[PDB]
């Protein structure tokens, strides 16, 4: 039902964060207080 929608959202970020055509002089910052509850797919070399 309701929950899965947010899943889609996060995926739309990830594949848009990387891929082909180096983004360039565009930098992103991530900040959190609860690191241990993060999806490991975020810690891939090239994304973070």
């Amino acid at each position: 039902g309701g929950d899965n929608e947010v899943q889609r959202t996060m995926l739309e970020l990830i594949n848009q964060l990387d891929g082909f055509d180096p983004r360039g002089n565009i930098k992103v910052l991530m900040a959190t207080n609860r690191p241990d509850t993060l999806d490991p797919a975020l810690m891939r070399p090239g994304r973070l």
Binding site: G1, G2, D3, E5
Partner: peptide, 26 residues
Amino acid sequence: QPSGNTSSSALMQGQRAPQKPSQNLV
């Protein structure tokens, strides 16, 4: 770990219907 959990809900989008246009152009 047994389950007694709950969940929220998304809405039903399909609500629109067509209507007769009433333009007055000569």
